Design a protein around this ligand. Sequence first.
Ligand SMILES: Nc1ncnc2c1ncn2[C@@H]1O[C@H](COP(=O)(O)OP(=O)(O)OP(=O)(O)O)[C@@H](O)[C@H]1O
Ligand SMILES: Nc1ncnc2c1ncn2[C@@H]1O[C@H](COP(=O)(O)OP(=O)(O)OP(=O)(O)O)[C@@H](O)[C@H]1O
Ligand SMILES: Nc1ncnc2c1ncn2[C@@H]1O[C@H](COP(=O)(O)OP(=O)(O)O)[C@@H](O)[C@H]1O
Ligand SMILES: [Mg+2]
Ligand SMILES: [Mg+2]
Ligand SMILES: [Mg+2]
Lengths: 152, 906, 391, 101, 384
Amino acid sequence: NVKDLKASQRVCLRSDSYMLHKVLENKADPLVSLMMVEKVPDSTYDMVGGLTKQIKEIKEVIELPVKHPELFESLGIAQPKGVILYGPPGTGKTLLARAVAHHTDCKFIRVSGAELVQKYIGEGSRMVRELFVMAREHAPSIIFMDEIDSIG
Amino acid sequence: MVDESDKKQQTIDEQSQISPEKQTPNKKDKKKEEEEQLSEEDAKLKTDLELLVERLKEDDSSLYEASLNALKESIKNSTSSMTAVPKPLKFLRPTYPDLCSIYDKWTDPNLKSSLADVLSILAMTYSENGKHDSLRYRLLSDVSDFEGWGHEYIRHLALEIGEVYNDQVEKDAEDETSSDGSKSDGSAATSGFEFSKEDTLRLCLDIVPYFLKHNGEEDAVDLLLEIESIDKLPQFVDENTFQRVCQYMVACVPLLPPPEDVAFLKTAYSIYLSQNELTDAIALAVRLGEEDMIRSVFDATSDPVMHKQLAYILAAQKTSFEYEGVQDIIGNGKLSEHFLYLAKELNLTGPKVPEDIYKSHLDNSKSVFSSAGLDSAQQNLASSFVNGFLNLGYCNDKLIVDNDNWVYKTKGDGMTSAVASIGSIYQWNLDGLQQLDKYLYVDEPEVKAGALLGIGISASGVHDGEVEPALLLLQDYVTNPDTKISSAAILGLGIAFAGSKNDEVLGLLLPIAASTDLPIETAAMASLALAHVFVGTCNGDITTSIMDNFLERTAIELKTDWVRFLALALGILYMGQGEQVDDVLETISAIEHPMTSAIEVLVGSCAYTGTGDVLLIQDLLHRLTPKNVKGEEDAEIKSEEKKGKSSDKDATTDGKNDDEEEEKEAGIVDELAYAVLGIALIALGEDIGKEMSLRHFGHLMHYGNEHIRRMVPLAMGIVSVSDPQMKVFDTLTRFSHDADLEVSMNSIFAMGLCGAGTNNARLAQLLRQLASYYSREQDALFITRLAQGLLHLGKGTMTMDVFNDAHVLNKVTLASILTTAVGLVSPSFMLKHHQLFYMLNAGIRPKFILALNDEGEPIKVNVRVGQAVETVGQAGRPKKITGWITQSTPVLLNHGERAELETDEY
Amino acid sequence: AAPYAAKLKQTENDLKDIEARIKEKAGVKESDTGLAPSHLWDIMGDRQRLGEEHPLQVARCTKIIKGKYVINLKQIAKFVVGLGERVSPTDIEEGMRVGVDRSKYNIELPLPPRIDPSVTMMTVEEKPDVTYSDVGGCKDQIEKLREVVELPLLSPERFATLGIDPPKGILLYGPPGTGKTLCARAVANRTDATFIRVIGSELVQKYVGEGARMVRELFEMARTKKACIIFFDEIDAVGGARFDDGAGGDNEVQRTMLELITQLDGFDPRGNIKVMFATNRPNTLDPALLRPGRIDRKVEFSLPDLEGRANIFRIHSKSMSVERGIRWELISRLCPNSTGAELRSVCTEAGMFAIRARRKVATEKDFLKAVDKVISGYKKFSSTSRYMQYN
Amino acid sequence: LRPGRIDRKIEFPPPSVAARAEILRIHSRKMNLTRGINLRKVAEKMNGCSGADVKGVCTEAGMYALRERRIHVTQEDFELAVGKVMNKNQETAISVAKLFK
Amino acid sequence: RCKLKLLRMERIKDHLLLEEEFVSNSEILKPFEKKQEEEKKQLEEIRGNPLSIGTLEEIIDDDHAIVTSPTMPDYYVSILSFVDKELLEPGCSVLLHHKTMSIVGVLQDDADPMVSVMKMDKSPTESYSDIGGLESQIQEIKESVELPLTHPELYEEMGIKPPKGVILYGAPGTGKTLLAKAVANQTSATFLRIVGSELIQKYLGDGPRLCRQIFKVAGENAPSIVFIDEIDAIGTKRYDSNSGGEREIQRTMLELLNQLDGFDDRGDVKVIMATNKIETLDPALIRPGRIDRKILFENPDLSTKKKILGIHTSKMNLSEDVNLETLVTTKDDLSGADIQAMCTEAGLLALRERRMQVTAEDFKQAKERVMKNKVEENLEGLYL
Ligand SMILES: Nc1ncnc2c1ncn2[C@@H]1O[C@H](COP(=O)(O)OP(=O)(O)OP(=O)(O)O)[C@@H](O)[C@H]1O
Ligand SMILES: Nc1ncnc2c1ncn2[C@@H]1O[C@H](COP(=O)(O)OP(=O)(O)OP(=O)(O)O)[C@@H](O)[C@H]1O
Ligand SMILES: Nc1ncnc2c1ncn2[C@@H]1O[C@H](COP(=O)(O)OP(=O)(O)O)[C@@H](O)[C@H]1O
Ligand SMILES: [Mg+2]
Ligand SMILES: [Mg+2]
Ligand SMILES: [Mg+2]
């Protein structure tokens, strides 16, 4: 009935005139589309390890306010915003952000500056609000917007 | 961190982060050898404290917990607590953080249960020494902040909160409670409360009320007085100390039901009397409803001074704020007694000076005329009343009125109510008498009667001091045998005096409202008047009014409408208190018939007032009984049924309104949603029930003083055209009026469409016309608030004639009541030493921010506006005095209040 | 921390939880329109229901064969169809839509041409009713509009007596802020002629060739309408300059530029379409609408004169609540030569100084303050005597 | 780069020589090694400025070992891989000169 | 602290409201009344079972329409016409009957992937005077944006047109972006917010089409506030040069003129623009007479930063070692985003020691790191 039904839920039909039968036991998330076509498996800190310092640096501002936002309320700090990772390519800059995310249980959303990850809106400008809204559906999340600036 | 060995001060802290070598081994072995080493253990106590002090910085639990874990053991294992009983007792000071560190910083069922009990017994016994008090204090103001103590310090104080609360719930109290061990009063825990209170008043305002409410005595509050009275100005300012005192009382309105609440409000009054503002004393004195406290404050200003000064003017201004005029009677008579200055003070207290300042406001505002003159049939009656509704208050539109053409074409009850509409044009003003005189001396007995109605209305702005009161003129007319003459006199008498009481008024309204033997449908007005006289002060709950209600119901039901008015009159009468309305609910319910159940449901609304959340579920339970009875069968009466149903609908709403002002004021917004859903429920539940509930909704909003006056009347209004009873629009517009031509523009525009567009009876057309013209005045000439103004949590008396009219179906008879709309609000203005008719500056702000008050205070940021503005209603209520830059001092504070300004300049 | 603080956190989270609960139990629903004067709708609903009388697969004639027609359904599939009993020999035209029956293909009902219109209907709206007693610019410039646009719509009798081909086109060009749109709104009340208003920048589409279709459809449809005015707004984009590139991407836009030349000139002249073109720069116009043969007398709306500003400020202050005895000439003097829109904001800032001053009127003094505010504004910016360079 | 939206800056430097040895080890944890190979010795042959260079030395050692078709990766393949990957540094874009102004 | 009283009272009335609603719906929302039972009998007689969706192309004035379905086939539909023939119009989604396609009804209320971008996905949790300081020219944004909505009364006394529009400009760090979202809190009018880098697209011609939408949505709410964040980002930003370039920039400016006013004469939209590059715009929008008062903001001076810093440190646990006035003293006329950044970095140093009390050292050392960003964002160091 209408209180077991909500939006974005897949159903099965017996077409007696399109008579709703059951919920479907399958769905493909639209955020998972982006992540699929990218294709990422999980990492930990043995894929970064040997630069032990980096793990500490990012742990303070990224990991903890997902885990306990009560620390940052007591402190009074206004919560962290953008965090720049930069260095030679081959230092596993991407691998550190993967490594935090499995422990924290975030959706590791690697964006790459692509129009190929989408096939459902198909431009990056309109996928800024919406990407946020999907990452809120499936919160917690890490939006790894990897800019490159090779584009054009 | 790691153990490395002690050779400096930094590394001793490191040693004991893993394992103390000074508090654990040493002390323990020592205690179990000889009782001569008790001398040394006292010396080592200070040493143990210092290592705790240093280590309240380690964020995670594990290396503070585990490290002190055997110290927690030493209490019962080696110290024992009975090897001398002074010596183990005085060694409990270091072991007490250790107990909390396994209790709370590790939640484990076996030890958290056990150690709650241990913390209570040893805390109470060791606060006899007074070193347990000091032990909390070094942790209260702590060292450094981290996770651990953010939980720890609440545990220390929770022992105290625990015991006093439990002593009330349980019929066992004392140390028989098994989750404590602390005695209920005694003197071993009494000292713990006294020391704890000093610090927490200084830094917090959190546990301070909690403890008092748990004592439940104005004694407890009077101990608080001693600490605060020093603190009044130097430690924290007068204004801040005031905010504390009103926060307690506002916060503890549900938490102290009426008999408990007034006992606490007596002490809040006393704090205010001692400090600077006697203005806040008066406000709290009205809130109780106590005549006595008012007199004390009048004496406090008057007796030490024999010179006109700000002081005499100040007492008279303070009593003026109550437009109920309970205060106005009290203040008139001490002023005559004192006999220094009669002339300026007696008028100022009375509503006579408020008439004069109105002339100045009216100049800027001007006068709007748009009144209909289009007569011919029923449209004659509509247009003549509409003339008054657009000019309510004190205005002038003389030339249209003296044209007696349209006046005389009215007929029946219309003639009486046509002259009444003329008098409300000159409402709150002594001049205009000449128009009433014409009708009084011409045609049929009906227009004479309507002239009298005008006197009552006009007298609302001049009576107190007993210089031309409504009683003087209208006592004659009651004596006159003609019925129309008597009904008009006593209705207007009731209006003029509102919350004021006097023997001649009271005793006039006494022989009648006791004789129901005579069949008059217009003797409702007899009780209506009596009800107002009582509101505003601790109730008489007069036995006469209950007597006649019962006798009329027995005698007749042939006029269900008369008795229906009478049932409401009791419920309006019983306001002014909530303690006393308990007893009369029991008296009426003794008599039990389905007709008496109707009377009860209204009086239940008033009875539970100011804490009700039980009232609301009960007023839904009444609704189910119709359907319950139907279920049973599946498995003269006309009058009785009708009264049952109508009372219920008015009561459900009336409970919501009454409750929501008195408890806090942020809940006001929520109660609006119930009504919207109530309308939908009532349309599929009963056809007859719908007719009443439409009208009650508009007055739900006006009584409660909602904060959203833009959205809801307009949204209701479109839908309610289809539904029967156009008397709904009239009742929406009493709320909508707010500041005129702010809200009221949308009403005029929307309502003129539905009115012109649809005609479906000339009866229906008349109501729709009346409503638009009410909402507007002339660039916000006056405002209407059902609240007193002084308290916006308080309830007035003048607007209870507005609240009356929605329980009975619409009539030309009802139109006579509806023309009066007293409940006018004064334009806040500065006074000095000569009497000033304007302001200087005000700050305006849409809303408060503060948690401290729910009445709010304006921020010192505001947007600046000039002099000579009428106070503005909800959707913009906060008003500030701006005079600090002009080096002026308010004497009469205003925060969005009705209170008029007086200023002190050196 | 403090003992009561510990409870504030719990009660806050109970609020968060109960809002979602109230929302979920109320439910989400889809609003559906109604009508109270219909309490019976199955007096004519039952006739439309349950048999075949028929809802029609819409088609369109692609070629008349003389004695049947070839239609393209919108399911694209083509059929020869005849004539039923609602249709005659003369009702069917080229490129006209017709409705046909789904069990057997035959012309059931003739229909208005072309289903492509839906964004030529988002440039059609009904007329703005702004008066001709408050207008922009108090010069002789609007009477020149009244001879080209307005009068041959009112009265073609005078132009048959002259014997001249009635005058149709006009350019509104010159400085910014001069109320060119205010006078075509003013004319929209007065003539009672349907107004069609165009944005030239909505005529460009990513897929080039789409806006070519667009223009043709609007203009021929308008010849079928009678007594209308098309206000070509913001056609500095398409209607601007033309030039050729070597690897550019400007050329796609120029397609619509070219289509504007060829519909206006037609292969016959405009069938009672009076055209106003509003260019906000007299420097962006195609050099084949620059020629005056299709744009007849063209009237420059310029910045106010020193007498014209005094008039404009008097309309604004008769409409404003003031104290008379304020000079409106003085106010024109303090100003440099500047837009007509500055004087339109002197009053509203004088109205905000009313509220601080606690007035119902604006008096002499505070207009001086407002005049200074806008003037220092133009000092801070430009286009105080610019034409976008070169009258 | 607006001031207050950047409260953490994580710079990854060019590897240290303790870090650069462990990158070689990370890849080798799937691989078979002939016992006695120190990837710290190889790290002293490297000078590096990115850990991409050392990922190519391991890939090359197992593809030399594939060419041989031995299960173990032999120690001369890690000698050959550094010199092969450094030639590859001079062929993706020159960067080690010492020849400066 | 002791905001308990509020939370209790609000929560309690919500509890009762949940109760009343649940019980109201069940068995006393009577489906046994004749006005409900007799109404659905003859409603369903023409209302489906499946109700084939159409999209409405055009109506004909004979009680007909021509629909094009999203499924494919067009239909020449009639209209049952108890949904009031003149209440629907092109672009609506329509309910057609599954025996023969007649317009049973009309759905109203839609959403698009293009108004998904506009709509709010949050409600601000920082309300007014968290922008406190620089409050001496907040009087031309609380008396043209907030007030005509709050009182139409004062603008009736003067009559003529009310204030429309403000543009905020100054150096960054004058709080413009949150100010826009804070005057929205007060008025309770539908607040849309659109970034200006989404009014630049990498495709051509469809830019003006996106911008044209934004104000039609806003006038539909009778009161709205539209904030364009960075309207200097449509006059500096471009993608590729064959679907962007000068032209893409040029067109969108021209479009926004018609939207701000032009011919449309739409409902009340208050507009808030924050910009600091006010010379990349048409000289047809930055003239007074559209955007009435223009507001200048200057870097906060010595006394103003005293106002600013009490805003940010009320969330902190202050020590008695902390001196707020010496933190103010050193800086000379510098941004208020800097003050916000120093307080954030002060709680980060406090967390580095692990202590949730914030000490004086953390503010005073974080000050110098903030000042190193001014004195080596220009590698000249001390001026040469
Ligand atoms: N001459 C005028 N008199 C009164 N008001 C004016 C005048 N000119 C402009 N305005 C005001 O400016 C507002 C907007 O002007 P409009 O949209 O007509 O621009 P425009 O003059 O066509 O210039 P542009 O082509 O540069 O945009 C109008 O609604 C009007 O209130
Ligand atoms: N003058 C100020 N007073 C108080 N807080 C400020 C001030 N200026 C900026 N802030 C704070 O800085 C943060 C972001 O500022 P916001 O984005 O609102 O400002 P902006 O002026 O548009 O530009 P920028 O973001 O570049 O500083 C918020 O936390 C805001 O409260
Ligand atoms: N720190 C590291 N530890 C182990 N392997 C690494 C490390 N950094 C890089 N790699 C290897 O180098 C490869 C390329 O690194 P890449 O992901 O391109 O780095 P970045 O994210 O810094 O651009 C990875 O796929 C991985 O095999
Ligand atoms: Mg790489
Ligand atoms: Mg233009
Ligand atoms: Mg910015």
